Amino acid sequence: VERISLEKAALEFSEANAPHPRIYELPVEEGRSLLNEVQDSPVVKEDVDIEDIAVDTGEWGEINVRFIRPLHQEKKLPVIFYIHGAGWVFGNAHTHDKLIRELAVRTNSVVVFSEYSLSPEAKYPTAIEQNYAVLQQLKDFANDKKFDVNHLTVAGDSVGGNMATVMTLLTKQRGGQKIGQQVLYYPVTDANFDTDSYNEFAENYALTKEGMIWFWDQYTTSQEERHQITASPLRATKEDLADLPAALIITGEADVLRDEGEAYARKLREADVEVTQVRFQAIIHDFVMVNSMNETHATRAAMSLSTQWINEKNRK
Amino acid sequence: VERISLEKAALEFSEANAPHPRIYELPVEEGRSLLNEVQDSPVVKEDVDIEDIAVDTGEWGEINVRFIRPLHQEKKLPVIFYIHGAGWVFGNAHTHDKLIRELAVRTNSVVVFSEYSLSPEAKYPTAIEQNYAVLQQLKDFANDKKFDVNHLTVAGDSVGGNMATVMTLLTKQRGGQKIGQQVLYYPVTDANFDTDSYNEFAENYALTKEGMIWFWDQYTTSQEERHQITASPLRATKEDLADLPAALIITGEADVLRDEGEAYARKLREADVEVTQVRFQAIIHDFVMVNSMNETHATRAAMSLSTQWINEKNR
């Protein structure tokens, strides 16, 4: 029961995820249902136009891609390619609904939300190849979905932050659709479970060290995989990271992933990438996604900073 | 020579302040001139209308208070009472010119800037009593200076953030002019020099543990005074802190004062005060004030977050 200072909704969400069996101790089908039920909880939602489109990723099959648009926009908007978190095992358009609607409206952008194949049914690198392939097709939707592919932000939370920063790496390496900038909400950057934040916040803050070990076990078959920079971008060299797009990296104080996210920000800064890195106090993992944490000072400030930072980038 | 990852301009500012004699080893007159010269360095400043008004604080004497207004504005604007940092010993309208012009123009506010008596010529609690007395005369200037006291933010950097929050303790204790919100940039909150941030960043990050000990020594050297909540607001109890105005507290990573800023945020939170606490990576002390740090990612994001937070509170 001894916690560091937390906002009330973060304490409450930490207590509601203390009991066993925990999400990661359930059969995956019950895990997915449980998070859908958490994200059934009441929240003020921005009103938007939604279209679901089947996209062909070539070798990695067909996935649903959801297009979010703010109401009554007559001009071509900037585009955010958004990659959802929840461990590679959970998540869909419903679990991240409030968050992508707020992004869409406050940045006056089209949000392209890829429903990539979840682990463990699909293994690394399916999801990152599926995401990179719908990125290379944004140009073919731009006209019909009234967005400008030249004003392209990639964004993600947790494992989506992981895969969003990895889209910039694949994009530089293979010469894909130019990404202007990247927004990473408490990303996964490394398969190391022994950072200072990983030990301090191991238990009692909803997401656990054991939770993260299990997610990664669902994600990879092996370990010569977790060393690859498209799995663990924290392992990239200064040369790998050179010329990558401008980054906004948001961490929570009470988060096992805090230190690897802050570590990654430093590597990008040391490779001369423009980096804005900001740690919100008294907040846990998943704080911009979870409906019940929507009115936290951390969620309000992180949403204001991220939308202002994206708006500034798009003004150009 | 070994430092954590810093933004280029923060590393440059840290290197420029490495030699002896330090600003705090100079006679105070020379330190004041040196910081004036640092803040002559080039910066694009927002355009404003400026009036300097001699205000009488009674017991603590007459000080200059600078009134800053955005151009071409006819309506009653909200007001920010801005208390400047630089250790109680340095600083003036010029050393903080870019920051207060940015705050005025981006919030479309009148900024009221008190040139309170500096230490060690003046001792605690003269500066806090002068600032409190100016807060109570805002109503007297509202009509001529076309602002609305009902939309009143108090803000300050470093010892200014110290004194801004103390403005909220005093206004509560004394029932003075109501303050809606407080913005604290990397505030001083306590006279303990052994926090982990005080020890990690003691040297090589421009502001030193040595410099902060010297600033405190110019202000008051009584342990009893340093322990009053009007000096070290971090010593405030839950009951002292209850019903205080909503707080934005901004810290930099590579700052001796980071830990006490972040601990003050916690105590407000525990008093059920509405607190937004945010730490910027790879930046030093004084990052929203110093002209050469103006284009830092930390400064741009801190000014965008603080200005929007103020606008959202006044709506």
Residue numbers in the entry:
A (entry chain G): 2 to 317
B (entry chain A): 2 to 316
The authors write:
In this study, we performed an in-depth biochemical and structural characterization of a novel microbial acetylesterase, LgEstI, from the bacterial fish pathogen Lactococcus garvieae. LgEstI belongs to the HSL family of α/β-hydrolases and presents a clear substrate preference for a short acyl chain and an acetate moiety that are suitable for the narrow entrance to the active site. Monomeric LgEstI exhibits a canonical α/β hydrolase fold with conserved key active site residues. The active site of LgEstI has the typical catalytic triad of esterases, identified as Ser159, Asp256, and His286, and is located at the bottom of the substrate access channel.
However, F207A exhibited a significantly increased hydrolytic activity (over 150%) toward pNA. To understand the increased activity of F207A against pNA at the molecular level, its structure was determined at a resolution of 2.1 Å. The overall structure of F207A was almost identical to that of wild-type LgEstI, with 0.177 of RMSD (Cα of monomer); in addition, the oligomerization form remained unchanged. No substantial movement around the active site was observed, implying that there could be multiple interactions among the residues that secure the interior conformation. However, Phe14 was shifted by approximately 0.5 Å due to the spatial reduction caused by the mutation of Phe207 to alanine. Phe14 in the wild-type protein interacted with Phe207 via edge-face interactions and was oriented toward the substrate access channel. The additional space created by the disappearance of Phe207 was partially occupied by Phe14. The pocket volume based on the molecular surface (MS) volume increased from 548.4 Å3 to 657.8 Å3 in the F207A structure. Therefore, area expansion could increase substrate accessibility and/or dissociation of the product, thereby increasing enzyme activity. The F207 mutation increased activity against pNA; however, F207A did not exhibit increased activity against other substrates with long acyl chains in parallel, when compared to LgEstI, indicating that other factors could be involved in substrate selectivity.
